Amino acid sequence: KKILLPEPSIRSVMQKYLEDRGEVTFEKIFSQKLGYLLFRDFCLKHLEEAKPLVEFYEEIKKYEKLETEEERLVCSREIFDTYIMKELLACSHPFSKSAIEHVQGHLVKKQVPPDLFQPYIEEICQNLRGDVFQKFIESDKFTRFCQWKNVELNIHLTMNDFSVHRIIGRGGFGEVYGCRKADTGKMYAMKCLDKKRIKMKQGETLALNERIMLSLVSTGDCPFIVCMSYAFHTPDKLSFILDLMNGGDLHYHLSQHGVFSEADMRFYAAEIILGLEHMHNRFVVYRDLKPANILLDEHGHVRISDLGLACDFSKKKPHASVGTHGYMAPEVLQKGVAYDSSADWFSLGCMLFKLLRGHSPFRQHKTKDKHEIDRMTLTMAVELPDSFSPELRSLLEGLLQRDVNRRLGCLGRGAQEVKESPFFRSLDWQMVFLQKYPPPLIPPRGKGIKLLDSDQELYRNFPLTISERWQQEVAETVFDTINAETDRLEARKKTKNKQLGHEEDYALGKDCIMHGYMSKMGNPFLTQWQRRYFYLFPNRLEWRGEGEAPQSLLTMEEIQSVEETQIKERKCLLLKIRGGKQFVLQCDSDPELVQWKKELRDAYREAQQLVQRVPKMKNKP
Amino acid sequence: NTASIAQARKLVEQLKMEANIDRIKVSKAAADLMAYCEAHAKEDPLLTPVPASENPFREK
Amino acid sequence: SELDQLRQEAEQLKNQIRDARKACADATLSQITNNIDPVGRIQMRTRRTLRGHLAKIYAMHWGTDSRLLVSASQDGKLIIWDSYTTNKVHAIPLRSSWVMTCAYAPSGNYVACGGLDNICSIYNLKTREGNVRVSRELAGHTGYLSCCRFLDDNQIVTSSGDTTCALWDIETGQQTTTFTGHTGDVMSLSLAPDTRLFVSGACDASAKLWDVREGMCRQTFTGHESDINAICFFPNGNAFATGSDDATCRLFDLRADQELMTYSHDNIICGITSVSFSKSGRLLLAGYDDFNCNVWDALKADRAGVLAGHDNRVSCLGVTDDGMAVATGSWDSFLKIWN
Numbered sequence A: 001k002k003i004l005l006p007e008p009s010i011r012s013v014m015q016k017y018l019e020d021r022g023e024v025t026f027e028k029i030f031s032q033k034l035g036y037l038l039f040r041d042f043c044l045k046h047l048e049e050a051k052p053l054v055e056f057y058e059e060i061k062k063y064e065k066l067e068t069e070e071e072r073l074v075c076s077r078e079i080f081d082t083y084i085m086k087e088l089l090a091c092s093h094p095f096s097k098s099a100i101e102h103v104q105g106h107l108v109k110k111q112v113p114p115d116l117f118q119p120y121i122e123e124i125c126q127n128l129r130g131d132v133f134q135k136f137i138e139s140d141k142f143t144r145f146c147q148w149k150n151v152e153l154n155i156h157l158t159m160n161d162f163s164v165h166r167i168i169g170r171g172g173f174g175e176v177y178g179c180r181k182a183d184t185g186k187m188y189a190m191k192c193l194d195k196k197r198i199k200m201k202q203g204e205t206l207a208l209n210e211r212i213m214l215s216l217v218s219t220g221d222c223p224f225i226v227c228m229s230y231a232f233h234t235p236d237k238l239s240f241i242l243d244l245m246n247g248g249d250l251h252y253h254l255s256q257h258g259v260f261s262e263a264d265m266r267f268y269a270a271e272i273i274l275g276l277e278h279m280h281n282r283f284v285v286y287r288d289l290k291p292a293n294i295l296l297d298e299h300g301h302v303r304i305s306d307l308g309l310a311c312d313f314s315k316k317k318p319h320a321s322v323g324t325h326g327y328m329a330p331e332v333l334q335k336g337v338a339y340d341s342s343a344d345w346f347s348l349g350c351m352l353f354k355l356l357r358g359h360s361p362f363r364q365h366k367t368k369d370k371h372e373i374d375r376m377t378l379t380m381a382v383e384l385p386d387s388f389s390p391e392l393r394s395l396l397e398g399l400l401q402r403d404v405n406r407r408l409g410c411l412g413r414g415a416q417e418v419k420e421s422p423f424f425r426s427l428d429w430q431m432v433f434l435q436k437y438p439p440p441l442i443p444p445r446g447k448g449i450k451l452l453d454s455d456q457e458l459y460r461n462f463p464l465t466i467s468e469r470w471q472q473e474v475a476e477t478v479f480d481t482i483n484a485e486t487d488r489l490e491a492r493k494k495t496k497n498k499q500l501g502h503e504e505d506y507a508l509g510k511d512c513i514m515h516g517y518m519s520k521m522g523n524p525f526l527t528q529w530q531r532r533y534f535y536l537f538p539n540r541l542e543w544r545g546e547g548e549a550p551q552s553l554l555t556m557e558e559i560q561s562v563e564e565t566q567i568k569e570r571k572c573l574l575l576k577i578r579g580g581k582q583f584v585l586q587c588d589s590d591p592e593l594v595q596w597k598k599e600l601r602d603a604y605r606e607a608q609q610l611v612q613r614v615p616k617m618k619n620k621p
Numbered sequence B: 001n002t003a004s005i006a007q008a009r010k011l012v013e014q015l016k017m018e019a020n021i022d023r024i025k026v027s028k029a030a031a032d033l034m035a036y037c038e039a040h041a042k043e044d045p046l047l048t049p050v051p052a053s054e055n056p057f058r059e060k
Numbered sequence C: 001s002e003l004d005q006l007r008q009e010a011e012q013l014k015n016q017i018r019d020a021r022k023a024c025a026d027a028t029l030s031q032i033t034n035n036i037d038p039v040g041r042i043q044m045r046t047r048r049t050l051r052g053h054l055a056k057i058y059a060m061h062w063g064t065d066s067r068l069l070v071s072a073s074q075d076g077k078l079i080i081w082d083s084y085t086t087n088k089v090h091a092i093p094l095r096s097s098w099v100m101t102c103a104y105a106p107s108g109n110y111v112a113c114g115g116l117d118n119i120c121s122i123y124n125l126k127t128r129e130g131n132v133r134v135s136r137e138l139a140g141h142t143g144y145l146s147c148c149r150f151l152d153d154n155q156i157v158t159s160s161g162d163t164t165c166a167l168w169d170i171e172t173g174q175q176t177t178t179f180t181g182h183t184g185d186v187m188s189l190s191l192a193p194d195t196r197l198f199v200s201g202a203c204d205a206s207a208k209l210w211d212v213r214e215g216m217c218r219q220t221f222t223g224h225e226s227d228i229n230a231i232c233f234f235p236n237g238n239a240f241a242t243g244s245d246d247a248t249c250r251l252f253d254l255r256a257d258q259e260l261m262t263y264s265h266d267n268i269i270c271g272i273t274s275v276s277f278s279k280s281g282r283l284l285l286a287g288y289d290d291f292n293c294n295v296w297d298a299l300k301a302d303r304a305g306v307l308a309g310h311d312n313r314v315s316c317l318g319v320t321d322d323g324m325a326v327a328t329g330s331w332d333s334f335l336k337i338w339n
């Protein structure tokens, strides 16, 4: 009912699984939250040669985050005096002249921007990259990494892994519920779409799309988009695990509050712009921007949600009329006519107008006719109420330009154009990013269709986990405690072994290729599963129970093939043998499955190759 | 290798060594083998089964 | 052409050799032994089964005490056994899983083994600290070690799939002498009792007699139609036998320089993996890929016995220096002791 790390033996397999994938590089490990965590714990405490580096890395990373110039003056002094000056005074400062001079010069012009020490960062990485990384790998902190990756790479989520709570949104294909992921305790939304409801309304592409789109925007922890951490499914349902937003959406609040003053609108627009920015930097157009796709959190800060109708424009620019009538640009509404980013900037205007006035600019006199709103979006320019301040007035006419070349944001520098509108003169965008502005509104406490294999083939690749989201979830919840517990559990197994005499490690001082737990059938007539510790050598696969040494084996010669097979609806390895015999293996996790398949195959091929060149060893007719 | 002049000389010198040995008659060699066998047939436990008493692998 | 001349000259010499041998073939061993008595039922039985190897056994050797033996296996261990008790005196996990030969040093202090690692590894049995360590890794072969026999505790001879054999000085690890001449993987060797000569049998279907101290081949015996997998000196150092994939053993005499006898039968169709003589030379013992060890009458050429208690190939055998016993080792993981 909570995460359990595999034993340290898991290293034999994971290190090889990772190596085959090229993942064992400082680059690929350092840039993972758990990897960084582990590498630093190693440097600081288990290697007094790299402590100063990482300590120096961390002081700079803290510096980057300092909000004010007053503060960056003070911290740069310290960092310079402690990790540069002193290190120079002891001829022990492995960095460029360029690095030192870049910082030095800047300090005396008291010139302290947030990127001040970036030059060192790249070089601190240079110095950790080599022998330090290499030792880290040899250490038990990298073993710990392997333990944590194996869990990562073996995530298979089911509804059962969440504690589902109350419904918080609904539309065409399903519902959103708030939930707790049992594992870690972390609160999320779960969006469940019904595959039946889907098939009916022929929006299989649209649910697929929302996943692919989420997968594009969910990295980098954007506090203005409702991002994804996982997706899985059941035979009935698509499930996205998303950021939980308890505050409901703007459209509801619009109608509760009445219209919003410009200043209130400004808060919303800012945060939204940042989210648009994030998506646009990832070549995604949201397309459906409007109050109801902006959710609020418990405090009033907002985020863009539901990327169903969003679209990649990394390669093919879209052309189709997709959005909500009232908010769609001309290039949108015009078919065959293509469009990128632009349409969101226009919807932004439309939506912004709508928060000021209660209706889309292009919805006149309570009109409920779509072809009318199409018409006067394409046809008529924007009559803007006497009351609109000139700056607002500038912004809205800037955003709602019909010509894309004349529209604010679309003129080459993206969101920055919009951030620079005089309507936002008063904002420090770092403070917006930091969510430091006080929100305007604080949410007050609240048929017989069939499913063929050809349906469920379309969802074959819906499941994923966003690695970074999972590591962060883990990082901030159970990582420390679990490392302590697991450290502690390891120290006891090593206590039992100096006393009960299981000291020598069978797998060393020989040519063992790999070892680890698998389970076989040991009862031929009964077919239950026995967990044993296996050791693969180039000419044989040995295993042992606990306590005693290995007393059975297969030879790479005996093995004719290794293939996947389904047993108790679990993917297992099937080994065909010499006699027309058979041997079945279950591995404890996907990566172990993958690696035992590869290595067994590799080892039996090579061994047969080799034995055949050897007259004493081979078969004679 | 078979096209090597040094290897071919080495082969010839070797066959010269092998050709120029003193050989005895097969009758003589064979008699000497026969005599050996008869001279040590006594010392050979696999030749007459021998009593459990003297043999470490029976009854012990 | 110099090369063509040397080639014909080699032929002439092969012919000169053939004729010198035929001038010696005045009678046969079989004629000469024609009136000695047969040997009767050689009725041998398993006294011990040595159970412990977890996979095929490839080779074994008796210590000179006629008591301990070493065995080498597909499981990547040497087991040193006390055949009197079946107690494993030592079980030695090897560094390479691909072992295929092994040898007990006369002194009893050392064993050796090796295989597809191309190395002859010398383990020391009696360390002063009471532990079994590799004392030497004799490296230099460019092919698998197929056989190895110590001369004493500081010199050892090896044969290889690199087609050579070699003599080593243990203390230094040097390959002091190289025995070249074979053109196929060398599979087996056998020291003479005096240890001043040894013979080797190879995949070239030929056996060669070598002088240890001078590093040359003295004689080359042919006549097998296929690989020689095994070879053994007759106990007086003047003949040896071979066992081949052609399904025959053969006795060759040094001083007559030629084959004296074939040991075969229309029924026995499988290759021989191993040969040994009884103490008196009277009996030739041969392991066969049909799971048996035939006992032959060396002087008469008659099948005299059979050892039949292995479920796979008999891959190695050996007789004790005291002559009390025969060990067979098999692809079925067991050694058996017989008499």
Ligand SMILES: CC1=C(C(=O)Nc2ccc3[nH]ncc3c2)[C@H](c2ccc(F)c(C(=O)NCc3ccccn3)c2)NC(=O)N1
Pocket (backbone or CB within 6 Å): A168, A169, A170, A171, A172, A173, A174, A175, A176, A189, A191, A192, A193, A203, A206, A207, A210, A226, A242, A243, A244, A245, A246, A249, A292, A293, A294, A295, A305, A306, A307, A308, A309
């Ligand atoms: C944002 C939004 C809805 C919603 O509540 N989504 C949502 C997403 C993540 C969340 N975290 N916390 C609340 C929360 C809420 C809500 C909604 C909720 C669940 C749904 F299944 C649907 C829905 O089915 N929309 C049709 C659709 C879906 C996917 C692709 C294309 N078309 C809509 N309706 C809506 O117009 N917009």
